[PDB]
Nucleic acid binder design. Structure first.
Ligand code: MG
Ligand code: MG
Ligand code: MG
Ligand code: MG
Ligand code: MG
Ligand code: MG
Ligand code: MG
Ligand code: MG
Ligand code: MG
Ligand code: MG
Ligand code: MG
Ligand code: MG
Ligand code: MG
Ligand code: MG
Ligand code: MG
Ligand code: MG
Ligand code: MG
Ligand code: MG
Ligand code: MG
Ligand code: MG
Ligand code: MG
Ligand code: MG
Ligand code: MG
Ligand code: MG
Ligand code: MG
Ligand code: MG
Ligand code: MG
Ligand code: MG
Ligand code: NA
Ligand code: NA
Lengths: 152, 54, 266, 72, 118
RNA sequence: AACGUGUCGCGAUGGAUGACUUGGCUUCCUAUUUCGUUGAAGAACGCAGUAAAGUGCGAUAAGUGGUAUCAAUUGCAGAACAUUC
RNA sequence: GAUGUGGCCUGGAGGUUAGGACGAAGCUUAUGGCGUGAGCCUAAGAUGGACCGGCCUCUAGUGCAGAUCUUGGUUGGCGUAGCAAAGAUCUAACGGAGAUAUACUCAACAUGCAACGUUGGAUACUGGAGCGGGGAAGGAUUUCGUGCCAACGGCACUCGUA
RNA sequence: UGGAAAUGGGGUGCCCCCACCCGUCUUGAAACACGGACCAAGGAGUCAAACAGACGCGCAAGGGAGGAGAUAUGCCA
RNA sequence: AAGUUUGAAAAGCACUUUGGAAAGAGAGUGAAAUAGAACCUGAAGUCGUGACAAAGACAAUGGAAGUACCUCCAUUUCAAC
């Protein structure tokens, strides 16, 4: 078993995924979730504008004590950020899904994202040095991402 | 309580039990039937060797 | 005697926010500072380690052993008890089953099988053969791979013969001079199926004695006296002599009706 | 057999019949026959009269075979 | 015989090369049994066999290798294709095959004389 | 509204349980059974066509000689008395 | 605190009676039924792949919620505290996948950001008790060339004592 | 005779009423008394000897070994 | 500390295509890939996603008795019965 959900019509759908991405899971969770119901072209425009810092990514769940901004009002929030490392990773994933649709013989201008899921992957371990001769964990948290889109 | 019992003298205050710090001092008889068989076999073989002497 | 205690462990004492269990000394490994010397610690000593001077064997009174053997032999001659134990005896001509002594002259397993088919023990032999299977549980890894039922036991007067019977699966062989209770009552249940030869059947009386004559082999042994002369107590309870003295049967009150009886005097 | 002991019945009782107050400690009254004249005097005097003292003459090297003498 | 399953299995899987030769034997055909009065022989390179068990049942071929390290023999006609199209052999346990023609040498003929049942 | 709560289907992280066992522990037996200055036990350095560890071996170095057997060893090279070199 | 229970449950032994590739053990549950209860049984698996149930006796390393309990894993705090001594970098051209990366509209800005090595310029610091040039103790290939960027250099790398 | 009705179970929400946090020492705990982030696996009245009482079994003015031997016996501790 | 316990057999995924690569989407081997390499089974705890139930602030959990809605559960009945 691969994907937690199944497209309505398989012959008019494209899929993509990536494992052990080495981006912060909490940052990638917010970046991927905002495009869940959007058309493919509209999702790609949003990521370009986030890199230009004219629009932001809303942080809805993992947002404890982050800054407030005026660009979060269009999402009905007050807190948002511009995580560039997560954005460029999601840009590559959309290109792969677009390539799969063209190979099948579909129109990328008529595709709508219908499924986005981000999960925690296995962690990697480093160490840090504290006062009074203590050693304490210094961990990294990568993530898995999967998605598919369907033609309207 | 203690009640009415015999005054005990069980004599087990030396290091007789083998444990993690003591070798112990015990003797078991788990080889008794094997030794009985061995002795009978040796007697039969010796009789065959010294035949016909009693 | 050394298992679980081959460490130089010591307790750290109070003042450090840890339990007072002894801990492994040293450093540089994953086991440094770990608990030791305890039935609850990983790698520790078990509680009450087993010893080799446990009481493994038992003593039994000689008279009680002889009594048990006699009872098993007596039970083997009741056809209902044999069926209850579980042997298949439906075509057997007679219990106790006694056959001629010429079977000791056989030399071929084919002849032995022909004799078994003639005497009609082949049903029990087939039961034993069909019951063979692989044991359930851990025992199959400890040289106890297969299990099967117990079949008929053939009693011989001496050690001669038995050449043609040794390889038959499901048939036990016994010598009348040394009868074993573990084979006469397997699992503690009486009623083994026994096939006697004439010579052993004749030797039985001299071996075990009677109620009045002592045994020739077992010095000063006689069969135990029964506690009851007649064990059919139902016949006694229904005999005419008892019914003569039993109390008369009286007439009882009528059974209560379906309607509830009244309880209110006023 | 271990299956007939009181431990099997006491699984789950948390105290095994020794109480919450007194508890089950190591040696609450000394080891063996200690205190026979001090704090076990009543037990020794009422159940074992004649435990302490000396009596009679001594016989250093006793041989029982010359003393064998059964009766009927 | 060996009442210890642990000891019996250890001897089988740690057997030397010359012991594995005897353990990897195969039965002879009915025609060959009548001729030599021998029920079975160890398998040798350049023998003719026929497969009696498995998916390759009924196939015939010539023995090309007795591996003896993987407890298998290799037959020329028993093979399959890989992903890239090349052909590889498939190992069959000797107790599943039957010998139909023996490779005879002077030493081999002496062995058959020793095992004659007549 | 959003955050948050609850139940169900699916999916992650994690490595318990069951089955398996060339290991351990324990108990017995047999005998032409007990090392070294004729240099032992232990320590070091080396040896393969390809060879780090381990195993075996000592400049005759993953081994020479003899007896038995009877066609392999194998990851890949390489070699090729069967009368048994 | 004492005692009773043809009272429940677990690993093995002597008997007896059954089951299993038309699917054993194990595992999952808005699967019900039974019992005052410990528990037992059936159903389903769009789970699994080779063993195992009942009854009578025997036997024991035989039942867990907590011991500042042992070992392994996980977790809220939390994208939070922070990553602030030793003054500092700027520019163009080469190199590189690391860009000038767009569905419509459209001239360009308001829709691909940030970051890297080398060379040439510019600006600074060390200031001869030196982030100069050589040795002892200690270390033992860290030295040199070519290649490479999974992990490591608590940010980064096309660079490196990797 | 059905995508049926009915009666019991099971699940989630809601209404009225009721209802202090477990384990422990203590005369007295819910407590401003101690141990208590979550889960899995592990974790504590055992073995031997002397004595006594109750209960089961054999024999009885007698009861019973132990060590050892002998031959069935050379499969069988 | 640590069972290299995939599978009967490596038959250990040729080839197309998107990507710098890691990899993804197809195709194929195999009875099974939900057996894809330290790969049998794959629990608890914690997390993501979809559908649904609702819900002020009475910390949450809990008892007793109803009701609204649901029910891959059980049993009964369906004709002068
Ligand atoms: Mg702050
Ligand atoms: Mg620090
Ligand atoms: Mg008192
Ligand atoms: Mg241990
Ligand atoms: Mg008590
Ligand atoms: Mg007290
Ligand atoms: Mg030399
Ligand atoms: Mg056990
Ligand atoms: Mg549930
Ligand atoms: Mg225990
Ligand atoms: Mg537990
Ligand atoms: Mg900060
Ligand atoms: Mg700062
Ligand atoms: Mg600071
Ligand atoms: Mg500074
Ligand atoms: Mg740029
Ligand atoms: Mg420059
Ligand atoms: Mg200097
Ligand atoms: Mg870094
Ligand atoms: Mg309460
Ligand atoms: Mg007080
Ligand atoms: Mg309290
Ligand atoms: Mg108070
Ligand atoms: Mg205290
Ligand atoms: Mg006497
Ligand atoms: Mg599988
Ligand atoms: Mg698995
Ligand atoms: Mg889970
Ligand atoms: Na005591
Ligand atoms: Na100067």
């Amino acid at each position: 078993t691969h994907y937690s959900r199944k497209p309505q019509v398989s012959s008019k759908s494209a899929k993509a995924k990536v494992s052990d991405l080495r981006c912060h899971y909490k940052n990638t969770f917010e970046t991927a979730n905002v495009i869940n119901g959007m058309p493919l072209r509209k999702a790609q425009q949003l990521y370009r504008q986030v890199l230009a810092k004219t629009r932001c990514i809303p942080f809805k769940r993992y947002n404890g004590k982050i800054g407030r901004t005026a660009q979060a009002k269009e999402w009905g929030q007050t807190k948002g950020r511009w995580p560039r490392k997560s954005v460029v990773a999601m840009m590559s994933l959309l290109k792969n899904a677009e390539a799969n649709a063209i190979e099948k013989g579909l129109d990328p201008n008529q595709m709508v994202i219908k499924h986005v899921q981000v999960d925690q992957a296995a962690r990697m371990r480093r160490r840090t040095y504290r006062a009074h001769g203590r050693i304490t964990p210094y961990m990294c948290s990568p993530c898995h991402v999967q998605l598919f889109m369907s033609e309207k | 309580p203690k009640g009415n019992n015999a005054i005990p003298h069980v004599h087990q205050k030396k290091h007789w039990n083998p444990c993690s710090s003591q070798k112990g001092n015990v003797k078991v008889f788990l080889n008794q039937p094997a030794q009985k068989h061995r002795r009978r076999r040796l007697r039969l073989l010796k009789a065959k060797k010294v035949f016909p002497r009693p | 005697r050394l298992s679980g205690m081959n460490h130089s462990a010591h307790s750290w004492g109070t003042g450090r926010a840890v339990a007072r269990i002894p801990r492994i000394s040293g450093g540089g490994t994953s086991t440094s500072g770990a608990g030791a010397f305890g039935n609850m610690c990983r790698g520790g000593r078990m509680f009450a380690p087993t010893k080799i001077f446990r009481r493994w064997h038992r003593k039994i009174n000689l008279h009680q052993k002889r009594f048990a053997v006699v009872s098993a032999l007596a039970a083997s001659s009741v056809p209902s008890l044999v069926m209850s134990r579980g042997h298949q005896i439906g075509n057997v001509p007679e219990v106790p089953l006694v056959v001629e002594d010429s079977i000791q002259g056989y030399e071929k397993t084919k002849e032995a099988m022909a004799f078994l088919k003639a005497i009609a023990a082949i049903d029990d032999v087939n039961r034993v053969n069909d019951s063979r299977e692989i044991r359930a549980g851990r025992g199959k890894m400890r040289n106890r791979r297969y299990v099967a039922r117990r079949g008929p036991m053939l009693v011989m007067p001496n050690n001669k013969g038995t050449r043609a019977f040794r390889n038959i699966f499901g048939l036990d062989l016994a010598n009348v001079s040394a009868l074993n209770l573990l084979h006469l009552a397997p699992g503690g249940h009486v009623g083994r199926f026994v096939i006697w030869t004439q010579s052993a059947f004749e030797q039985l009386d001299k071996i075990f004695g009677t109620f009045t004559e002592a045994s020739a082999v077992k010095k000063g042994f006689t069969l135990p006296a029964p506690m009851l002369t007649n064990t059919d107590v139902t016949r006694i309870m229904q005999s005419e002599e008892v019914r003569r003295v039993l109390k008369p049967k009286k007439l009882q009150a009528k059974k209560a009706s379906r309607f509830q009886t009244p309880t209110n005097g006023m | 057999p271990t299956r007939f002991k009181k431990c099997r019945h006491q699984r789950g009782s948390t105290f095994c019949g020794y109480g919450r107050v007194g508890k089950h400690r190591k040696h609450e009254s000394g080891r063996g026959n200690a205190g026979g004249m001090h704090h076990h005097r009543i037990n020794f005097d009422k159940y074992h009269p004649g435990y302490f003292g000396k009596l009679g003459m001594d016989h250093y090297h006793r041989k029982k075979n010359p003393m064998w003498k059964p009766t009927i | 015989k060996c009442g210890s399953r642990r000891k019996a299995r250890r001897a089988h899987f740690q057997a030397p090369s010359h012991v594995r030769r005897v353990l990897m034997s195969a039965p002879l055909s009915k025609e060959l049994r009548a001729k030599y009065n021998v029920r079975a022989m160890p398998v040798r390179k350049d023998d003719e066999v026929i497969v009696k068990r498995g998916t390759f049942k009924g196939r015939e071929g010539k023995v090309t290798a007795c591996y003896r390290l993987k407890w298998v023999i290799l037959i020329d006609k028993v093979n399959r294709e890989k992903a890239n199209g090349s052909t590889v052999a498939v190992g069959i346990h000797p107790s599943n095959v039957e010998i139909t023609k023996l490779k005879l040498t002077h030493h081999r003929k002496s062995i058959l004389e020793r095992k004659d049942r007549s």
